[PDB]
Amino acid sequence: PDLLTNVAENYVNQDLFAGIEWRIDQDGKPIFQGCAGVKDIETRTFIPKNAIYRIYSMTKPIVSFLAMMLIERGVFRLSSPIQNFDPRFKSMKVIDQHAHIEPATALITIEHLLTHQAGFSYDFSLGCPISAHYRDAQLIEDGGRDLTDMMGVLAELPLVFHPGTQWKYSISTDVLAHIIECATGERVDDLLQRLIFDPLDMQDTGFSLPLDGASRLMEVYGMRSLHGLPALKPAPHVLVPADLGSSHPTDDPDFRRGGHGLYSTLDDYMAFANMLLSGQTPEGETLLSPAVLKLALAPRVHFGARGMRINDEPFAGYSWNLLGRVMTDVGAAAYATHLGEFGWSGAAATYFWVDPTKNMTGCVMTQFLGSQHPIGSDMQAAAMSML
Amino acid sequence: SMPDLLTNVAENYVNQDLFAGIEWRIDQDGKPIFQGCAGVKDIETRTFIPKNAIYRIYSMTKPIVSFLAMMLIERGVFRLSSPIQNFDPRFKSMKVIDQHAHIEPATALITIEHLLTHQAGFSYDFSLGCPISAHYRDAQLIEDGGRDLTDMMGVLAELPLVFHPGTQWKYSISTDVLAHIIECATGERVDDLLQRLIFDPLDMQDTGFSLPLDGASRLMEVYGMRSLHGLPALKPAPHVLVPADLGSSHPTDDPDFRRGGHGLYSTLDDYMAFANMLLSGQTPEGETLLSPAVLKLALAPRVHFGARGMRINDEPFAGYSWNLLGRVMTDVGAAAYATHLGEFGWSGAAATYFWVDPTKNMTGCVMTQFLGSQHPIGSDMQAAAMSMLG
Amino acid sequence: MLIERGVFRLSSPIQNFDPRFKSMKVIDQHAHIEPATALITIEHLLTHQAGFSYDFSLGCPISAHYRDAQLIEDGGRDLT
Amino acid sequence: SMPDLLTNVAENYVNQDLFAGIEWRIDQDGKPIFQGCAGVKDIETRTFIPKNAIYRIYSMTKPIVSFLAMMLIERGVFRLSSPIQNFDPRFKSMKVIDQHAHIEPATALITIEHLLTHQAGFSYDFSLGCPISAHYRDAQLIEDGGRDLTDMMGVLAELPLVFHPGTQWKYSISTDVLAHIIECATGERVDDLLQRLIFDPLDMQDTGFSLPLDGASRLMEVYGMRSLHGLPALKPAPHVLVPADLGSSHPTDDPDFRRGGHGLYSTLDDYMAFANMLLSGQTPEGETLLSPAVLKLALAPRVHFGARGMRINDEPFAGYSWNLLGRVMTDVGAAAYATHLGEFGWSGAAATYFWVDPTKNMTGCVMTQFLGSQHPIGSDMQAAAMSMLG
Ligand SMILES: O=[N+]([O-])c1ccc(OP(=O)(O)O)cc1
Numbered sequence A: 001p002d003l004l005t006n007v008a009e010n011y012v013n014q015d016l017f018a019g020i021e022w023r024i025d026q027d028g029k030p031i032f033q034g035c036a037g038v039k040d041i042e043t044r045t046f047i048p049k050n051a052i053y054r055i056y057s058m059t060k061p062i063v064s065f066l067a068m069m070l071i072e073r074g075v076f077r078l079s080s081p082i083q084n085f086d087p088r089f090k091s092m093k094v095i096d097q098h099a100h101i102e103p104a105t106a107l108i109t110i111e112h113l114l115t116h117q118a119g120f121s122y123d124f125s126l127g128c129p130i131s132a133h134y135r136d137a138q139l140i141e142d143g144g145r146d147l148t149d150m151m152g153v154l155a156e157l158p159l160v161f162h163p164g165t166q167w168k169y170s171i172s173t174d175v176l177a178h179i180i181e182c183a184t185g186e187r188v189d190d191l192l193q194r195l196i197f198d199p200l201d202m203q204d205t206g207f208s209l210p211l212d213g214a215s216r217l218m219e220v221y222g223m224r225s226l227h228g229l230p231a232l233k234p235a236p237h238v239l240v241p242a243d244l245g246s247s248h249p250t251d252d253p254d255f256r257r258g259g260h261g262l263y264s265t266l267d268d269y270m271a272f273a274n275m276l277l278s279g280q281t282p283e284g285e286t287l288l289s290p291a292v293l294k295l296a297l298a299p300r301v302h303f304g305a306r307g308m309r310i311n312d313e314p315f316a317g318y319s320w321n322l323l324g325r326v327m328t329d330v331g332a333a334a335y336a337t338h339l340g341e342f343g344w345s346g347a348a349a350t351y352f353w354v355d356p357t358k359n360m361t362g363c364v365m366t367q368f369l370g371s372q373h374p375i376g377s378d379m380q381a382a383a384m385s386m387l
Numbered sequence B, D: 001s002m003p004d005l006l007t008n009v010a011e012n013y014v015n016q017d018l019f020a021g022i023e024w025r026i027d028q029d030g031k032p033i034f035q036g037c038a039g040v041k042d043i044e045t046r047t048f049i050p051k052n053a054i055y056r057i058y059s060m061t062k063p064i065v066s067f068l069a070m071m072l073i074e075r076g077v078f079r080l081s082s083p084i085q086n087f088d089p090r091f092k093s094m095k096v097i098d099q100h101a102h103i104e105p106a107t108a109l110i111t112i113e114h115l116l117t118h119q120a121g122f123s124y125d126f127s128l129g130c131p132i133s134a135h136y137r138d139a140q141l142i143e144d145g146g147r148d149l150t151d152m153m154g155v156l157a158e159l160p161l162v163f164h165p166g167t168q169w170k171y172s173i174s175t176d177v178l179a180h181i182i183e184c185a186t187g188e189r190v191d192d193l194l195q196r197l198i199f200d201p202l203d204m205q206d207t208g209f210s211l212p213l214d215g216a217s218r219l220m221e222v223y224g225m226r227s228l229h230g231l232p233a234l235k236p237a238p239h240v241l242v243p244a245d246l247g248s249s250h251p252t253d254d255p256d257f258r259r260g261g262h263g264l265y266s267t268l269d270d271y272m273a274f275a276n277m278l279l280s281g282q283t284p285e286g287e288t289l290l291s292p293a294v295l296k297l298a299l300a301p302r303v304h305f306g307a308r309g310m311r312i313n314d315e316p317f318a319g320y321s322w323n324l325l326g327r328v329m330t331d332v333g334a335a336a337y338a339t340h341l342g343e344f345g346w347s348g349a350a351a352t353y354f355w356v357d358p359t360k361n362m363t364g365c366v367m368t369q370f371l372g373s374q375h376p377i378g379s380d381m382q383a384a385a386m387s388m389l390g
Numbered sequence C: 001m002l003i004e005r006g007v008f009r010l011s012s013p014i015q016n017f018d019p020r021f022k023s024m025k026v027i028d029q030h031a032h033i034e035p036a037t038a039l040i041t042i043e044h045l046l047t048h049q050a051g052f053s054y055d056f057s058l059g060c061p062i063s064a065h066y067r068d069a070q071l072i073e074d075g076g077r078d079l080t
């Protein structure tokens, strides 16, 4: 049966998500797709054609792919120290949970940024020795602050471990976007447009809305604590519109970030996902060589007993490569997958995957912050089970 | 023939514009042997240090409330092993948070002993890098001095600890929890218990959580830029003699203000009475406040530290272990300033400091008011006194 | 099959379906008892990593209490 | 000037309906310095505590049988290193079981020293979570008091140990094994040996495994809900003053009942005679029961514990190590109630407790009958006496 529809319709019928779209492609063509629910529960408008989503950290694989392109082109390399491009990142310090501060004993590199092993953290990180100082500095909160200036403020704060030595999901993709700007003399949104979006015909993807985008923007729900005091337990899963403050503007021509901030559509994100199966456009234009794509996808960070975790939530059987998660042990996985399946997700519950063993890609688009229901993994499992 | 190094230290500090006013006294065999004063009550006015000047002693409150706990143990109200949840069920089912966002139930009950040793897993609002201090600040545990002790404890009780009770050491709000548990166990207020069991018998008439009737004109001005409850600083505040803003954390005339870990006003003379008593457990007249057996139980080294040593916000207390009342010198060859084996006492945020040295039958106290001092005046005065007493 | 059908998932805490399994404790061979520090999941049950034992388990810190409770012995008792 | 905290403790316990009747005595320099009684013989009848009241002292039997072992060592019957299998071949070829169902041969012989230190690997029927206690209960080792010591030991000998002899510590039935090995080595009965070598010389006329002829009317009633040999409890039995059913585990008039780890009846006065003797190894008249060298051998700390400390059924004995006769205080800074370095003694299941404190030439004993007390009356009485003796 159509497990994907059953999952999505159950979520809508239980008042857990307002609206959901999905598509799964094989060999670059749709084999499953659908939608459930509405754009917004307040007026129950149907999900529009080419509906627009805040994809949050699904921005990261895109910005990471751009960095790989610049590496291939010789702009910098995995081992390049970031201080070479912005000296504000010379002389970093490292703080610990016992209030001890000392100089970093290793320089932060491009590779560290792409692997979240640089020692940065995130404003919303619970129990973190530095997240209070991120919150005070409004790093995530102040969406109106130019990328360049936000980085100056971040650069003055201590890391939470010595670069290279541990893993922690972090604001490092934003650092990467900034370093890209320093290295190229170009803005990251312009680079993304020219090198990735245009070639893949992703006309609806950017850090601001298309001129006709307002009526297509999905409403966002949920109570997650994104820049306030980190919650000691998850907020109740209730469909109430989320307040994004000034963290995520719709029409700021200078808003650009590395770790979040893109608006996209299901169709646009599917084009990016399909490309990751080969490094080419559908017409056959190369965006990244097979060699460098293999370098980007190979498992690079391996995890101990407790596995990969973010705010203590597990990613069972996953390792980290230069673009996001990668399945390295089906016997440890918590939901259907195959060896080498890779991808990432976003705070508003958007999720995608690429499964090279099946030449398969999939994406679930929805808008819920702080979900207590792992819709992304439920939809991947459903799709896997339908092959 | 040794010169007066005590006066020299105090004088230099005042002449260097580092502290406004400083008073000190060192007693031996219960009688003053060195004493002095330097500077003024306040720098704005240069009013002279009044007779019986009054100081906010902050954590020098801790040895007093700890001593009261020991008296109650001696009297059978509770024991070191008593789980605090027996007296306040709000402390049943504690959780423990870590630096990786992981929360789990505590695997051990918090006891009276844990509170007196700072091994309960509590923290403090100003603790830099702490997995929970952000939640303390949001709750305004320290900032909101007007909140009753009992109500503040209800808010604290809902927060997780930062390690499992008994398994580590971290200087903390646990003495406030102890003051509260004392009230739960006895059905009395901690300020009344302190008044009747300690202050009255020792004639400490100027000591309490609010100013005496004639106290306002005797209150020393407090200086410095330490932030007691704001975002913890990444480096020490500059040492500048500017008056400190205490907000509403340390009221002068709130008849219900009472705490375990700070909040007392006292005077040099009153505190010396307490310190001298600690040499024997008796009042000068010979009333026993605490038997020699239980005083020995309280002073014996109880928490021992591992290479890193005892630290608070990463500042070292070199060669010190912890007993039920505060610090205790356990290795002179690791000490960072003059002392003798067994020397004990504590200090307060505004740079007040005292010690008791049983090998010399000596006590010492320096009183001053500076929050966030970059100069360890307490240890400098102790070292000076040690150097002067053979 | 029920996982494939979406009834629950490997990571589902069992207490979500029967709250009698909230607040489990853990015993050891030295008589020490403490609260469990992790919730039991469907995956734990399928892998025998939940911490349960068996009435007939020799040397087990809890099998005596299973035997006293007749868990295996009392076949007539309803599963629930 | 210190008030009578001993009477206060006892009184409160009786007035709170927590214990039926309590007697205590503290001696210094071999003469009574504090003493008293509180409550009644039995709550049903409220009969007053009789003269020379008799108590089941349970594991306060252990220091007595241990002391007899030391006398026999001094006399050359055996040595600390003697393998017990030399005296009873039933203890040849022991096995060791673990919590994972694995059984293997013991890699070391059990010695006299192992039995006196509870390091032989034996356990006890009531031990919660134990790899072997289920088999002890099936065998009715404790329950069947009517079974001769010699026969019970044959049944025990067939069971595996829970660790290899010498490698760990667990409070156990090993003192019963010792009593038995004493009988094997000497060809005499342990009760006769105790009578001749210890009770007679110390004039302990009311002490033995059966009641004196006029004993029944003097026997204190025993209360409480602890289950001595049933399925071990997952949490403490409620503390309720209801008479306890001892079944046939503790007969009053069985001329062959004798054990190493429990079973003696005694009186406060008789036990104080034993305790006082332990200060010197001599009778009041000056007969040597045990030379100073061997008494020192017996009292020196012999088993040292690792962070977790000494525990029995997970209850702590904080700051205590173990010597050949029972507990010994080795760190006052880890102690959970007042004491001095070197204080030693033991206690019994029905809440009887005694201590000897060589630094004060002091002994103390509290007698009461409550099985499974949730209130540590023994330690409370010790703390009270310590507080009263400077
Ligand atoms: O900017 N943000 O609010 C923000 C940025 C990144 C986040 O992380 P994610 O949940 O992995 O997308 C979550 C929130």
Ligand SMILES: O=[N+]([O-])c1ccc(OP(=O)(O)O)cc1
Residues within 6 Å of the ligand: B058, B059, B060, B142, B228, B249, B261, B262, B347, B348, B349, B350
């Ligand atoms: O409440 N307070 O502001 C506060 C309490 C305790 C303190 O700790 P101290 O520096 O050891 O006195 C410091 C400040």
Ligand SMILES: O=[N+]([O-])c1ccc(OP(=O)(O)O)cc1
Residues within 6 Å of the ligand: D058, D059, D060, D142, D228, D249, D261, D262, D347, D348, D349, D350
């Ligand atoms: O035989 N018994 O019933 C028995 C034997 C030993 C006991 O151990 P205790 O509590 O240390 O006296 C308790 C009970």
